[PDB]
Amino acid sequence: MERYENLFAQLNDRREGAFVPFVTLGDPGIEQSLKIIDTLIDAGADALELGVPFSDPLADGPTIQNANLRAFAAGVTPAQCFEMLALIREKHPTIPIGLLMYANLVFNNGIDAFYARCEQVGVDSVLVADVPVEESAPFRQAALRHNIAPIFICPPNADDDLLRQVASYGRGYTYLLSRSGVTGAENRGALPLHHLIEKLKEYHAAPALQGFGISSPEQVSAAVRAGAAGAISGSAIVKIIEKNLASPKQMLAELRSFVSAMKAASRA
C-alpha cells in the first residue's frame, strides 16, 4: 500500500504537518487501549506509532518503561497485539500505522514471518529501535518484500554518510531524533538542524518526522516550520494514560483535548 505517501501528499496539499502520537499496545488493557487509539484518531492523529510490549525496551525512558509494564500486567502478548492491529486497520482504512519494535520480537521466530504478519494485518511501517543502519540489511529487505516501510533514525549530528544511508534505506518517513538519550517528555530536544532537514531532502529521503521530547503544541509548530513533515509525541500521551488509570472516561477526554491541541498546531 502507499498510506504514508498518500497522507504526505494530502497534508502537503493543505500546507499541513503530520501529528503522530505513540502509545503502547494494550496499555493499560486491550479494550481500553483500543478505545484510546480510536480517541487519538478521532481527535485528529494523522498516523500512529504503536509499541509492542517488550521485556527490555532499552531506547525508552521511565514513562514508556511503565507503559510496557502495565501492558504486561494485563497479560498483553505480541499475538494479542497483532489481533488489535487487525481490528484497528479494519476500522480505519487509510491512517498510516507504524510499529515500534525491539529486534528480538522481530527476529526470534523469523524475520520474514514477522514482516509477513505485519503485511497481513495492514501495518505500514516498522521501526526496530535496536537495529542501527549498520545491522539493518535483513530487516529492511524483509520489510520491502512485504510492502512494509522500514523506518530509520537520523540522530541530530548524523554525518553525510549516515544521512545518505538513511535516505536510501528508509521508506515511509525518516525519523529525526530531537536529541540523544531515550524517550521522555521530561527532556526537550532541539529544533531540527536546517542542514539535516535540507540534506535529507537533497538525498530524496522519506519525509521527516521529528520525535523525542515533543510534548507541547509550540514544538509541533516549530518542527513543521523547520521543514519537517510533522512530529511524533509519545511520553506526553502515555503520561495522560498513567495519570488517569482510575478514571477511564477522563483519560479519553484528556487524550482528546491534548491530541486536538497538538494537531491544531500542525495546521498552516
Binding site: 517488550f54 521485556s55 527490555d56 525496551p57 532499552l58 531506547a59 525508552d60 525512558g61 521511565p62 518503561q65 509494564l69 502478548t77 505480541p78 499475538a79 529486534a103 528480538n104 520480537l105 527476529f107 526470534n108 521466530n109 529501535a129 535496536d130 537495529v131 542501527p132 543502519v133 549498520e134 545491522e135 530509520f152 533514525i153 537520523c154 540522530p155 549516515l162 531524533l177 540523544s180 538519550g181 531515550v182
Partner: protein
C-alpha cells in the same frame, strides 16, 4: 563500518540504537590505537603487576586428585586484588576511558563483583563511577553495595522490568545513550555489542598466557584441557584465548545448571537457549516462546544471566570448545571439597568449573589427564550462602 570484525560467525554484532553507534565506533578506534601503543601497554602492565598482583599463582592440587590419573592445577585469579579476575579488564577499560578523555564511568552489576571492580579502578584512576544494579540484587548484595559506596561510587537501584541484572544492563545503555560524550560504559563481561566481547577478551587474555607459561614450566607440556565457568564469558575467554590455536588443548566452558536443566531453573543459554538479539548482540539466550527475555537462575549470582558472550557461541558452533553444565548441588560439593582438601575457599562461580573437573576425574579415574581449572574468584562472599544451605543438611 568498523576496524575489526564485530562478529564471531553468526554471533555478535552491534544491535544498539543508532544514537549509540558513534560511541561504539569511538571506543573501537581508541582500543585499536591503545593496542598498538607501547606506553598504554606498559601502563596497563604496571597496574596489573604492582596494583593487582599479577602474575597469579598456578597451584597444583594433589590432595583432591589422590588415587587417580588426573593432575589438576588451579589458576589463582582468586588471589587477584578484589578477589576475582574482573580486576584485570576494569583496569584496561579505565585506561581506555582516560585515553578517550572521559571522566565518568557507568557500570552494570548483578552479583556486585563487577560494581566493586569498576569502583576500585575508578577510585585509583580518578574517574567518577556510577553503577546500575537491579533493586532485587541491591537487596541481596549489601556487602558489595557497601564496598562500592566506600570506594566513592554512586549505586543506582534499577526498579524497571525484573529489577535484576538484565534490567541494570538496559539502564546502563539508556544512560550511555545520553552521556557517551563524557562517560565511558565499563561493561562487565565479554558480551554486549562490539567492541566489548573483543576488548574484554584482550584485557583478560593474560590469564591464559600466564597459565601456558606456568604449565610449560611445571609440566613441560600444554594442558589436556582448560576448564572455566561461563556467566557472561570473560574469565573463560580470558583462559581460552591463548590456547585457541593449540588444537590439542581442550576448552571446556561450564554453564550454571541451577536446580537442573530439566527444571528450567538454570542459566545455560549456550546449550539450552535459542538465538536471539538482546543487549546489543546476537547470541543464544533464555527467552519465552514469544521472544521475551527470560529469568535465569543459579545459586551463584555471577553466573545468573540469560545470555552469553558471542565468541563462546561461535567456539561451540565450530566444535573448538565444548560447553557443559553443573548444578547448584554439584557446585556446592566442589566448594566444600576444595575448602577441606586444599584450604582454598573458591567462589561459587568458580566452583562450577571445579565441579566439572572433579567429574572428569571421578568418571574416568584411570584416564591420564592434565587439567587446569580457572579459579576465577575467592569464596569468602559465599560462606553464609553455603552455611545457610548446609544448615538444613
Amino acid at each position: 563500518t568498523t576496524l575489526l570484525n564485530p562478529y564471531f560467525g553468526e554471533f555478535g554484532g552491534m544491535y544498539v540504537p543508532q544514537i549509540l553507534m558513534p560511541a561504539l565506533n569511538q571506543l573501537e578506534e581508541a582500543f585499536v590505537s591503545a593496542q598498538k601503543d607501547p606506553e598504554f601497554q606498559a601502563q596497563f602492565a604496571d597496574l596489573l603487576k604492582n596494583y593487582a598482583g599479577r602474575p597469579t599463582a598456578l597451584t597444583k592440587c594433589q590432595n583432591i586428585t589422590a588415587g587417580t590419573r588426573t593432575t589438576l592445577y588451579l589458576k589463582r585469579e582468586d588471589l587477584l586484588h578484589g578477589g576475582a579476575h574482573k580486576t584485570n579488564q576494569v583496569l584496561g577499560q579505565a585506561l581506555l576511558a582516560k585515553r578517550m578523555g572521559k571522566s565518568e564511568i557507568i557500570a552494570e552489576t548483578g552479583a556486585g563483583q563487577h560494581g566493586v571492580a569498576s569502583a576500585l579502578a575508578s577510585a585509583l584512576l580518578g574517574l567518577k563511577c556510577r553503577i546500575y544494579m537491579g533493586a532485587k540484587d541491591v537487596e541481596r548484595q549489601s556487602p558489595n553495595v557497601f564496598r562500592m559506596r566506600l570506594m566513592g561510587a554512586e549505586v543506582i537501584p534499577v526498579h524497571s522490568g525484573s529489577a535484576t541484572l538484565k534490567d541494570a544492563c538496559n539502564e546502563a545503555l539508556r544512560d550511555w545513550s545520553g552521556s557517551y560524550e563524557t562517560a565511558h560504559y565499563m561493561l562487565g563481561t565479554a558480551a554486549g555489542p562490539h567492541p566489548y566481547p573483543t576488548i574484554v577478551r584482550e584485557f583478560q587474555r593474560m590469564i591464559g598466557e600466564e597459565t601456558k607459561a606456568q604449565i610449560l614450566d611445571k609440566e613441560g607440556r600444554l594442558p589436556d584441557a582448560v576448564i572455566a565457568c561461563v556467566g557472561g564469558g570473560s574469565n573463560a575467554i580470558g583462559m581460552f584465548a591463548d590456547f585457541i590455536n593449540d588444537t590439542s588443548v581442550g576448552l571446556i566452558g561450564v554453564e550454571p545448571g541451577g536446580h537442573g536443566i530439566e527444571t528450567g531453573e538454570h542459566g545455560a543459554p549456550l546449550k539450552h537457549g535459542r538465538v536471539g538479539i538482546y543487549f546489543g548482540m546476537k547470541a543464544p539466550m533464555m527467552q519465552t516462546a514469544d521472544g521475551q527475555i527470560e529469568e535465569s537462575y543459579s545459586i551463584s549470582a555471577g553466573l545468573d544471566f540469560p545470555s552469553v558472550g558471542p565468541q563462546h557461541a561461535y567456539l561451540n558452533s565450530i566444535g573448538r570448545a565444548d560447553y557443559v553444565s553443573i548444578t547448584d548441588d554439584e557446585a556446592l560439593e566442589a566448594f566444600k571439597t576444595l575448602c577441606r582438601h586444599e584450604g582454598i575457599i573458591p567462589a561459587l562461580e568458580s566452583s562450577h568449573a571445579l565441579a566439572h573437573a572433579l567429574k572428569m576425574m571421578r568418571e574416568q579415574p584411570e584416564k591420564e589427564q592434565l587439567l587446569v581449572v580457572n579459579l576465577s574468584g575467592r569464596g569468602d562472599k559465599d560462606i553464609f550462602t553455603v552455611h545457610d544451605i548446609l544448615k538444613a543438611r
